[PDB]
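forwarding from the other thread:

> can someone predict this with chloride ion?

sure thing
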Amino acid sequence: VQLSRGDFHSIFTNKQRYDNPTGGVYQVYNTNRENLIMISDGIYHMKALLRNQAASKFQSMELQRGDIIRVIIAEPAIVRERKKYVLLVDDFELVQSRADMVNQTSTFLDNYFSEHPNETL
Amino acid sequence: QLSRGDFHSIFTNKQRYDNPTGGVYQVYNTRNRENLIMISDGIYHMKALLRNQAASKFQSMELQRGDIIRVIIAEPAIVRERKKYVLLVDDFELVQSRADMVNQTSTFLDNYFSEHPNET
Amino acid sequence: DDDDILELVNRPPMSQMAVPIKPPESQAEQLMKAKGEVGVLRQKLSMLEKTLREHDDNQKKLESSLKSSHEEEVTKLKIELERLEDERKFMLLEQKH
Amino acid sequence: DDDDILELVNRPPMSQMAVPIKPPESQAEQLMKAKGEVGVLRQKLSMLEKTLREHDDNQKKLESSLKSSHEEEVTKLKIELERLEDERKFMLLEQKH
Ligand SMILES: [Cl-]
Ligand SMILES: [Cl-]
Ligand SMILES: [Cl-]
């Protein structure tokens, strides 16, 4: 199984990708506000807000750091006067349970875009 | 403390048969089948069928051997080929929980009446 | 072996103070029954709305047929009246001396 | 913190495939809700039966009032017919008598 390397950057810079940010393969990076998680594309790590079916599935399956998911329904969202990036995940599928971390020294997406602010749509 | 020999009075005395209430008895043995228990008067032990509020109360309270009760609503009954005596208990009150057995060598009432059948 | 005694559980009590208590049901049994009742009541309601609507459509249809049957009878009699009115006018017009 | 992010939980989704799922409820929470629904549906059904019965009683009442009024009108016309029959009858009797 391979993660969609650098896809979080593509979601906010490529229009076709922003319009439909689905099909991405991500690793859970870190785990009320229990539905707000950290996900990893192998290069960048960003916040993901689980909603609807995803929020139910993630909680019942007790998904945690290292599990690999494929996003099926998602919306991109930028908040706090364009400072904060979030992927709203409405549906996903479990790809692999408790896999080894592909990267532990990944870059926080919001930190990248604060340094490169012109790249976003 | 128990109504000593009352089970015998219930089936031999008409006034007692007509209204077999107020008796103080000790639970002798436990376990709808669960609602059929063995009760003791200190001399005799007989079967008791708990019905209505008494069936609910006994089950929720988890009454067992050694407990002392006072029968409030009851009906006498002699059922299969007269070898079967039962007290239908519709209501009772808890007198004492897990008291020591007043008698362990008591006589089964049906066994007594099989030997003395002329008095019923 | 005590089936003949257990048969007396439901025999009507002589005391009016003796009250039947429904056998305890677990939350799971009660939730299933409630959910099942919800489905049954929803079916009954959907059916009864259809019935009310049909009865209403039928009331309207039967009233229309009634009014139309009446108007036919009233027309027949009015036509009969005009005929007798014309007869009398024919009699006045021709002069049977 | 991330309150501005968490605020998006309830923002209507772009996808019609995105379905809200109520956070898990215990059997006790569900039993209360279900019992409440049962009561509401039973009230709605009891009320709808009353309505059907009333509509039925009204159909019967309105038809009876209709038949009564029509019969009054038919009687009025029949009375006028007999009057004209008698008039003609007298005119003929005069024409010979
Ligand atoms: Cl009972
Ligand atoms: Cl539960
Ligand atoms: Cl007249």
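Chains D and B do not touch (no CB pair under 8 Å). thats all i got for now
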